[PDB]
Amino acid sequence: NSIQIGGLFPRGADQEYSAFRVGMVQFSTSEFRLTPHIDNLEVANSFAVTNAFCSQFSRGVYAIFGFYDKKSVNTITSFCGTLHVSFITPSFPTDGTHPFVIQMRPDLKGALLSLIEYYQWDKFAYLYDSDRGLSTLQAVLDSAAEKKWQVTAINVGNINNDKKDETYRSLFQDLELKKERRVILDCERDKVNDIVDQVITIGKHVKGYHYIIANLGFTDGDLLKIQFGGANVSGFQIVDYDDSLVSKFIERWSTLEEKEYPGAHTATIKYTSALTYDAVQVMTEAFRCLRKQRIEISRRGNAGDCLANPAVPWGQGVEIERALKQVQVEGLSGNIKFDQNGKRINYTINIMELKTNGPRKIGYWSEVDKMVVTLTTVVVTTILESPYVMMKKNHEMLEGNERYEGYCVDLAAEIAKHCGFKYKLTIVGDGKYGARDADTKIWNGMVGELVYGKADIA
Amino acid sequence: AVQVMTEAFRCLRKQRIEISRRGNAGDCLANPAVPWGQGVEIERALKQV
Amino acid sequence: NTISIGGLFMRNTVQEHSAFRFAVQLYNTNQNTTEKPFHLNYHVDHLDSSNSFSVTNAFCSQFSRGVYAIFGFYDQMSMNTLTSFCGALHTSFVTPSFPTDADVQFVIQMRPALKGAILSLLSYYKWEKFVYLYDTERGFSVLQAIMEAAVQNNWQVTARSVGNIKDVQEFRRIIEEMDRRQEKRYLIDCEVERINTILEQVVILGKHSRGYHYMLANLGFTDILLERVMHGGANITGFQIVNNENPMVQQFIQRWVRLDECEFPEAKNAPLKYTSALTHDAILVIAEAFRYLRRQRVDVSRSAGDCLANPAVPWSQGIDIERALKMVQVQGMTGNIQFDTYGRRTNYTIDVYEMKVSGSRKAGYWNEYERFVPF
């Protein structure tokens, strides 16, 4: 049997549409398939979004897959909620709660806050785009007092606008006058290199910068250190190319003909396209067991039915909503599970850095734990405290273990001897003993060095 | 309550004189709800008395 | 002959609704036929706004009746719907609501921007370190302006989004944390209701009056409950666009408080909200625009039909009505009323109020040309 669904695609979401079509093939069976009706719309225009949504409602679909932006998200949430038609989307997840919305995209704010803490940043620029939204910036500003962050927030959404000269003046004051070198880029993934290029022409000693790309598709665009002027670059990734599921997908996707399947024939897939493919799996798993309503005729929709026809009875629509939210599957974006408000839970975001050989996973952030976890001669960590460890008076002439003397220097020699190991005395970087920050939940001092693997004995 | 309804309603729009017909309870399921924007005007008129 | 307009009212716009009926009433009962060449009609729809569906339906209903313009309200949720439909159908929306963050067409925004006045007064007081508490009910424009000015002027602003706080303990925790930073100066850019809640926690706490300065960025100054805080020695700065000494305001008010509570709810049990004065001024602007179109023998017909008709071709008179609306220069309850190409108040005046232990007074005024002028 078949179930009719809507598909509302923005102009320029070519690869996402290819991924949707590929998903429809992959997840169809001889026993069950989805029948989509595709509309292509200006998502920034709430009138046009209303017309599209209402036309799908009119046609009588089980669900609408689609996109929204900052300007149209309230249309979607209010119409879904009123008409009782489920909307499944890879768009930015909403801060609050809204029924009849299934959010394929994991929240990024938690992982970003954790990564800032992980690098122990206390001062940075935050380059945002107001047309994109300010929710993530607000999360960072909310935490800045408690975490002791000096944030300089700059709207690079105005970098080509009338506020352009103001934007350049702002970038100049922060990078040149204040010598900022830690930069968070919260922007459309395909705008990263354009913004960076501008930063590089404006700043100085740019090789020494450290960017965090606040976006879930770290490797969605080319990452060439040379393009970044030699800087450090960190970011986030929800599609793990080491996953067999993902590598198998890419083996197939990479040979699809690019004219026929715009955006395919690539070794990577944009995270939004991955979420679109995953959405087809979710709808398929949700719907394949729902009642086979009497085979009816599907007819072009009339947007006016939003006002002419009554809402789907809540008891009817909620069965579909619940079926979607109960789905538990593995997809390109990893473990997919939803809470009662349609938000992804139990997901993992990979933490990436751009290394010599290319982007590398250095760790991960799990939604259940909400901290950055690091992935893979005795190093003795110790502290300069008299009379345990002290700098000999003539340390300049001495190297290694010989630079120090004290109760603990002697004690180290004794236990190394009794245990049969060679060692290297190192003073703890932050000069602390070891306490766990109540907020960032991270260990400092000598304890931190043992917990994080930077030393093997204190 | 008759005073309240009288004060609330005497200023509301004089809708076109229609015919009043015995009601059918089944219309609770057959007919749509009064549009909220319409009904709320009457509700508010009552509460403002 | 007869000019009909639409009226889109929301939750908690009862007094503005009453001010709307009454201003239309004043226009029609004017004896002078030069001032009243046509009869002005309206149809009102009440809308929830919680829903984009509910909103589109109310707009489309009014639209199919064939209105020549719409007076109404939007909030953060309904704004995109209403302004996008008005823009697509070349139908002019005239509103007392917060001015849009974006530059749009077919929206005449009766309420002046507050940010220019806020920045000038921050400079007048030499605030270089302060707390900024804000909700986003009236747009992201002020927030974005403050953040950027903080960069450009190297200020130390501690900013907190408090629009989602339901537990008043949270306000006290925030203030204590600000105390530990020795914050004495507060810019509060919130809805009046939420400003009232904050000022109340300030009073409960104690010792947050003398030595403190609250700058309250909301044109609803007269509805803010600040007397207890005034009595404790705090400084307060406020903003208004309505002068109660203006003879026009005086004359409106004297008639207004004589209206009976049945035909005109909220006229006698509540002081006049500034948005009600803007509602009155909106009728002055609509009347003037159509008096102008008549004078100029420009016609306007519509018909009108289906708002989702595809296409999708707006009436040609649409542009002329918008143009007529945006070109007016009239004097109203909110002073001089003029608009730029984006329907934004231009050449408006904001009165600046100061409350100190030595008393309360208008401390000066702000306009776009001379900025802050104290007297």
- Contact call for C48 and B44, based on CB within 8 A: no
- Considering only CA atoms, which of C225, C156, C210 is closest in space to residue C187? C156
Q: Are B11 and B45 in contact (CB under 8 A)?
A: yes
Angle at which helix A46-59 crosses helix A73-83, to 10 degrees, equals 30
Q: Work out the end-to-end distance of chain B between its first and last CA atoms, rounded to an integer number of angstroms.
A: 11
At A249 the three-state DSSP class reads helix
On the question of a cis peptide bond just before residue C312, with omega within 30 degrees of 0, the verdict is: yes
Give the residue on B whose Cα is nearest the Cα of C56.
Answer: B37
Q: Give CA–CA dist A100/A197, Å, rounded.
A: 41
Residues 6+ apart with CB under 8 A from C335: C241, C243, C246, C348, C349
Helix, strand and coil content of chain A, in percent to the nearest 5, comes to 35, 20, 40
**Separation between Cα atoms, residue A407 and residue A412, nearest integer Å:** 9
The secondary structure of A37-76 as a DSSP string is: EEEEE-TT-HHHHHHHHHHHHHHT-SEEEE---TTTHHHH
Those residues whose C-beta lies under 8 Å from the C-beta of residue A359, and which sit 6 or more positions away, are A218, A219, A223, A237, A352, A353
Rounded distance, CA C230 to CA C243, Å?
Answer: 21
Interface test with C, best of B4, B36, B44 (most C CBs within 10 A): B36
Nearest to residue A41, comparing CAs of A70, A12, A5, A18? A12
Q: How far is B17 from chain C (nearest CA, A)?
A: 18
In chain C, residues with a C-beta closer than 8 Å to the C-beta of A79 are: 51-53
**A252, A300, A301, A308: which is closest to A277 by C-alpha?**
A252
Least CA distance to A83: which residue of chain C?
C53
Q: How far apart, in Å, are the Cα atoms of C228 and each of C133, C167, C169, C178, C363?
A: 20, 21, 19, 21, 21
Helix (H) or strand (E) holding C209: none
Report CB contact under 8 Å: C262, B49. yes
Q: Which residues of A330-368 are buried (b: 16+ CB within 10 A; e: fewer)?
A: ebbbbebbbeebbbbeebbbbbbebeeeebeebbbbbbe
Cα–Cα distance for residue pair C21/C2, rounded to 1 Å: 16
What is the H or E stretch that residue B18 is in?
A: none
- At a CB cut-off of 8 Å and minimum separation 6, what does A396 contact? none
Chain centroid offset of residue C75 CA? 11
Helix (H, G, I), strand (E, B) or coil at A207: helix
Q: Which chain C residues are Cβ-neighbours of A78 within 8 angstroms?
A: 50-55, 77
- Dist CA C298 CA C284 (whole Å): 20
Neighbouring C-beta atoms of residue A250, cutoff 10 Å: 18
Candidate from C14, C54, C58 with C-beta closest to B48: C14
User: Distance (Å, rounded) from C-alpha A104 to C-alpha A225?
Assistant: 31
Q: Do B36 and C14 touch (CB under 8 A)?
A: no
Mutation test of the interface with chain A: which of C50, C52, C85, C129, choosing the one with the most A Cβ atoms within 10 A?
A: C52
Put simply, whether C149 touches A (Cβ < 8 Å) is no
Q: Which amino acid is at A274?
A: A
Q: Collect all residues of chain B within an 8 Å Cβ-Cβ radius of residue C14.
A: 44, 48
Q: Count Cβ neighbours within 10 Å for each residue of B17-45 and write b for 16 or more, e otherwise.
A: eeeeeeeeeeeeeeeeeebbbeebbeebb
The number of CA neighbours under 13 Å toward the Cβ of A349 is 31
Kindly state the helix (H) or strand (E) to which residue A350 belongs, with its residue range.
strand A348-355
Q: Give per-residue burial for A104-134: e unless 16+ CB within 10 Å, then b.
A: bbbbbbbbbbbbbbbeebeebbbbbbbbbbb
What count of CB pairs under 8 Å joins B to C?
30
Task: Give me the residues paired with residue A234 across strands.
Answer: A212, A353
For A439, phi then psi, to 5°, come to -85, -65
Does the distance separating the beta carbons of C87 and A46 come in below 8 Å? no
On whether the CB atoms of residues A177 and A125 are closer than 8 A, the answer is: no
The answer to whether C259 faces chain B, any CB pair under 8 Å, is no
- Residue A86 tokens read as 């489920």
Asked if residue C207 lies in contact with residue C184, where contact means CB atoms within 8 angstroms, the answer is no
Q: Order the strands of the C2-9 sheet from edge to edge.
A: C39-46, C2-9, C70-72, C93-95, C107-109
Q: C35 to chain B nearest CA, in Å? A: 27
Per-residue H/E/C for A303-346: CCHHHHCCCCCHHHHHHHHHHHHCCCEEECCEEECECCCCCECC
Q: Which residues pair with A7 in a beta bridge?
A: A38, A65
Pick from A72, A78, A170: CB nearest C51: A78
Which partners does chain A have (≥3 C-beta pairs < 8 Å)?
C
Residue contact C148–A155, C-beta within 8 A: yes
Q: C14 and chain B: CB distance < 8 Å anywhere? A: yes
The answer to whether the beta carbons of residues C165 and C134 sit under 8 Å apart is: no
Pick among C15, C46, C48 to test the B interface (most B CBs inside 10 A):
C46
Q: How many CA atoms lie within 13 A of C269 on its CB side?
A: 9
* Residues of chain C found within 8 Å of residue A71, distances taken between Cβ atoms: 80
| Shortest CA distance from C264: residue in chain B | B48
Structure obtained using: cryo-EM
Of A75, A130, A145, the CB nearest to C81: A75
Instruction: Note whether C262 contacts B10, CB cutoff 8 Å.
Output: yes
CB atoms within 10 A of CB A451: 16
Q: Mutation test of the interface with chain B: which of C45, C53, C65, choosing the one with the most B Cβ atoms within 10 A?
A: C45
Which of the residues C262, C263, C264 would you substitute to probe the B interface, choosing the one with the greatest number of B C-beta atoms within 10 Å? C262
Enumerate residues 6+ apart whose C-beta is below 8 A from A434. A443, A444, A445, A446, A447, A448
Any residues with CB less than 8 A from the CB of C85 and at least 6 apart, and which?
Answer: A46, A47, A50, C56, C59, C60, C63, C91, C307
CB A15 within 8 A of CB A263: yes
Sheet of C359-367: strand order equals: C156-161, C129-134, C185-189, C213-216, C235-240, C350-356, C359-367, C371-374
**Token pair for A172:** 């100049």
From the CB of residue C125, how many other CB atoms can be counted at a distance below 10 Å? 15
Selecting from B36, B44, B49 the residue whose C-beta is nearest the C-beta of C14 gives: B44
CA distance C177 to A162: 38
**Smallest CA–CA separation between B49 and chain C, in Å?**
6
**CB spacing of A46 vs C52 below 8 angstroms:** yes
To 10 degrees, what angle do helices A46-59 and C79-88 make? Answer: 100
Residues in chain C closer than 8 A to B38 (CB atoms): 45-46
Handedness of CA C107, C109, C114, C120 (dihedral sign): positive
Please, what's the b/e burial string for C290-317 (b: 16 or more CB within 10 A of its CB; e: otherwise)? bbbbbeeeeebeeebeebbeeeeeebeb
- DSSP bridge partners of C160: C133
DSSP state for residue C190 in the 8-state scheme = S
Q: Does C58 touch chain B (CB under 8 A)?
A: yes
| SS3 call for C55 | helix
Given an 8 Å threshold on Cβ–Cβ distance, is C14 in contact with B35?
A: no
Backbone angles phi, psi at A359, to 5 degrees: -65, 140
CA dihedral over A234, A235, A241, A244, signed as positive or negative: positive
* Nearest-angstrom CA–CA distance, A231 and A209: 5
**Token pair for B10:** 């005497």
Spell out which residues of chain C touch residue B7, defining contact as CB-CB under 8 Å: 262
After which residues does chain C break, using C–N > 2.5 Å?
A: 302
A75–C80 CB contact, under 8 Å? yes
What is the residue-wise DSSP string for C1-35?
-EEEEEEEE-TT-HHHHHHHHHHHHHHHH-S-TTS
Q: Count CA within 13 A, CB hemisphere, residue A49.
A: 30
**CB atoms B36 and C45 under 8 Å:** no
Q: How many alpha carbons lie under 13 Å from residue C208 in its C-beta half-sphere?
A: 24
